[PDB]
Amino acid sequence: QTWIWYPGDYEIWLGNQMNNRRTERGAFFPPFWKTDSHYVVVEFSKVLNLSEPEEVFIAAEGTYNVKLDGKLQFGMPETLLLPAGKHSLNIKVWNQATPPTIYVKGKTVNSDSSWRVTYEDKEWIDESGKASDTSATIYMDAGCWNFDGATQRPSQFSLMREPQQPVAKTEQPEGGILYDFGKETFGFITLKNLSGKGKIDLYYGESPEEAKDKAYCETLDKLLLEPGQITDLAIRSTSPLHHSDNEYTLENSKAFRYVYITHEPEVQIGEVSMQYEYLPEEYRGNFRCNDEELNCIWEVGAYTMHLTTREFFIDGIKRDRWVWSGDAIQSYLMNYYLFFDSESVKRTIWLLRGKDPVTSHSNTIMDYTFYWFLSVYDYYMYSGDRHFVNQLYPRMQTMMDYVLGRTNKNGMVEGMSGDWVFVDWADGYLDKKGELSFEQVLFCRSLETMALCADLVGDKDGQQKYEKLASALKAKLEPTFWNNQKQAFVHNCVDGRQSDAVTRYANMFSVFFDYLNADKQQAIKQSVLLNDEILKITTPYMRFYELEALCALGEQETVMKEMKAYWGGMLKAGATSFWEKYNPEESGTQHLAMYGRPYGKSLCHAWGASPIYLLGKYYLGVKPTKEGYKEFAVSPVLGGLKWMEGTVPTPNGDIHVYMDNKTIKVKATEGKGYLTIQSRRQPKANMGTVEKVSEGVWRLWIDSPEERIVTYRL
Template identity: 60%
Template sequence: MNNSFLQHTSSAATWIWYPGDFEIVLANKMQNRRTERGTFFPVFWKIDNHYVLMDFHKVFDVPEQETVDIYVEGEYNVKLDGKAFEGSPKQITVPAGKHKINIKVFNQANVPAVYVKGKTIVSDATWLVTFEDKEWIDETGKASDISATKWLNAGSSNFNSPTQLPSQFALPVKEQTAVSTEKGENSMLVDFGKETFGFIKLHGLKGKGNLSVYYGESKEEALSTEHCETLDRVKVNSTEKKDQTMELSKAYRFVNVQYDEAVTLDSVSMLYEYADVKEQGSFTCNDEEINRIYDVAKYTFELNTREFFIDGIKRDRWIWSGDAYQSYLMNYYLYFDSETVKRTTYALRGKDPVTGHINTIMDYTFFWFLGIYDYYLYTGDKHFIAQNYDRMKTLMDYVLARRNKDGLMEWMSGDWIFIDWAAGLSKKGEVSFEQLLFARSLETMALCANIVDDKDAATQYNTLAADIRKKLFDIYWNDQKQALVHSRIDGKQTDNVTRYANMFSIFFDYFNQQQKEAVKKSVLLNDQIQKITTPYMRFYELEALCAMDEQSYVLKEMKDYWGGMLKRGATSFWEEYNPTKTGTEHYEMYGREFGKSLCHAWGASPLYLLGKYYLGVKPTAPGYATYSVEPNLGGLQWMQGKVPTPNGNIELHVTKEQVKIKAAAGAGTVVLKSKTQPTGNNISTVAKENGVYEIAVNPGSEYVINYKAE
């Protein structure tokens, strides 16, 4: 392990553990809280657990003797310079000089974790950890100084108090009251006013009998005692009034509480459960409908940002790699919360051996690699890459072992090829979309191999990536259709053209400009090509159009699609929206009357689109060391907003005549299309082709750039 990847050394003590172990265990707890109508509903893929025995160590140069407090989750011993202290000391004294501290911890029930606090000796992410120290002692009693032990830097988060035990972590809650309550003879229908998530609290509960709580994202669902997706049953036996909080948090807007005649209930409230992350990005413009869409997208994303980025709050509450990948991108333009990205990445990957694709879905394995690629681009965090490189390699080894005779990815037993929820979408043969994601994943591996100086592997991955990219066009490009076809079966192209591989090839820059223009016409703007009805793939379709300077078209699509959900009463964005459906049809999915999630993370994509393609801010070097700003009003009169970066915000105000910009860090380039050469305070303008101008932006200064939009 190359410790030079650590970006800083903390002087504050924090709880530490083996990287990924806390995250995996927390994911196990969260994902296995899912119930359907009161029945436990676990995940259907392999889940891992923590290593039960852990060795933590670090060498310190101590300027003067100090007293060190030690807190541990588990049974443990402590060594100083190889000599063990008696028992399991809660405090040790360390003399001046250079010393190595080892703490070995065993914990079967919870993640082995330590918190060490002295004046200079503190536990933080610079400590080294291993789950097997492979230390052996020969017949003379001498411990071996040769070992094959693999050491990693410790994992940590923000558990910075000795009493803040990692094993006791829970999301914060706050009281919320209902907007309205309709009382029946032995029932209450409670409306919280909008989609929400948390623990239902029953007040003034008294009597003897049964009580049922039926949850609904819609009023119809809450009233459907036979078909609502989630419920709680309570046995009441109390001669005095009492309050009772439901054991599990759930998603709902409406709650239908029904109880026996011998039971009385005063009122119902809730404890709203949320992730304590801070908004940093923002967007407002002259169009109030777009502002409303942005605000509801924000709230949708808030609800689905929990211990991890999850898919939806009602039904699954699981970590799905394809959903999470989109959440990462939205996060970079709203919260820029790296910790939730890292937690989710660790949880999805799990541990070796790899026995199946992530979530059992081939494309979701590839989206995991893509998430690594973008994480590095947005954050510049080499340390996280180094910590996970071995896990990346073994996952890619699994993928490479499942290629067919032509070196392509094709369905094998145990695989689920998802792509999208779309009627009649074929998954047979060698699907072009999977090859495209495979190529990008290999490029990710090459990038990461170079970061950790694994040059031979980098060469291998680059060669494989180039081969798959070539095959993508040799096999799937059809000159007559001016597009990539959907698949190849038995060595022959199918006639079907779908949007998926074509739109990804645009913003991956796999197409040349001529191909991009052809595909825009033949696929993206072609109503004969099967339309997309999920926000999941609308995300990428609209991104491809934005990448082709079609912001005016995309703005109309946003108003039609996301605005269409708002017109139907949505208070958060849905898993799927088909404008042709009417009434309660909008709630149906998976063959169930209320199977559809009305609050799904992939519905919040305007956060990303408006930040990256309207404000136009994106990193061009890891961690925003350099970045570009290419604002595009897309028919708006004005817009303003903030885009977060690792070192502060980029602030923008844009009209058709002026751009105001201020950035906290990094070297930026504003790219403008203007009828005249831009002017302004202390600006340096470089003219490019076709009326495009570039203006350099340095950190700390506010620039006012006057131009004339085309």
């Protein structure tokens, strides 16, 4: 048994709670897009056929009633005896404050996802006493997480805490002490042994410059110490203090490496430490090679991912600390090569979608609506979780309804009033008007995704509709955006006119989406991907995809050179977590500014950890080829490295890969698949038969957890 609720409703409520924890210099800062709510009245039900009478314990968050075979029980019973035979247990709950949720426990009757929920049962009695026909009522399978204890109330969920001490403190000339915690971290400040009275001010920073800048630092706190109590002035919450040995831990979490603290004359602070907050995670994925710089890049990437893997996958810990679609899709991917936390992926997907009616694109960003669609099928391929797709499908349909009612005469998408056509942070060089080739590519992929999901859930009318729309748009891509002279997809079209500008976005995506044939993909490699004439990318975010394209075209060596220079560049700049944006042309404090503010840039953004994904999927070369890794593919490439080794998690297994200049070892504890080897002459295998795919390329079919060892020579 476990606590259950209407699917997606707990996630939405919990997401609102977390997102609304963002602050800017002491002020509450909710998202600018619409905030949705859970359904305040829901009915939980379960049809029972018991061979023997059993008693169930009932717990719930909210006001509720209990109906057994149509008969309303008195009040709110905590236990109910269930007779033998066929019965129908119905529990309707009302909860405006937190999501309606129940906990039922018995010998055989237990609350779980096999229970059905609805927010509109429509059962009424006519004047004779006959109940209405509710066979038309729509039900959903109940949602749940891991709250298996009767006392583990879903609404009280909070992340784990762990004590930490700073590694340095320095008194400042203008007063106060500047604490260095060693590296980017996240948590609650603890002040031990407070005495006296007066104000106490906290100033946080991811850099010493931000922490010391009391007037422009992004986040801070202001407290008032009084005899026997202290008060958080920002939220006006007074907590009690013991006169003897006291301790006060701030109520709200903050991201930071440095914390500058000051206080009035009559205040005395014994000790300053913190409570590191985190979501328990198992580092199931792993990677390391001879290049120690890359090793550090991977480690820093993993740490960045963990800090940004909280109640949901977020953009950054300092600023925004909200769930964004563009960032999230990459988090899911990096997650598949690190934690493989499928539960977090689903919670984030539920949250980003929100509820109906649809009033705008995801986060109001057009391209973000498409990432959301793509992320669902990506999750299915890696987890094999068909049930999730079935539960989300209705909401996927209505989101696509919104998009499809906004296409133009060519069936393409153009930014409309209220839309944000983002693409990337390219310093303002990108034209957002007309039909961007990049957006149609994403849109086309979204239609293909919807077609594949419609097929998975069995909606054939929908499937046909999406396939027809996807096929028509796809056939228009080259006739519309391809340019023979530039040998690439132009940036955009306005009134049917191609722009002189060619950006790398539509081109790089067309490579791993496979929208271009072999010949044009190679053309793009030279005319776009390796052409420094084409506008460069300055965010780890799009380098994720730029480099992925290159890896798809087998340019792992050039990519290695780029990853080392780009990410290693942030390290050499003092990074202990990867940033939101990085231009190696800038220097010093310039790296800290963004959004027109001196310390506006987040120095810990989920999308800065790109390497986690690139190395796992293109160097260790692992990826599922059938949902949930029912079937996989391992195509390792060293790309300059002498030796590398790693692990890639799967639903119920792992794929270990080792490789040096003459040997490859693979141990797949789940599924079957092909190990592809690039060699001059035929490789030798300790198992199975090595088959020649083509010139210089070989394959080996692995069909068991027994480690395979092959020797080759490129």
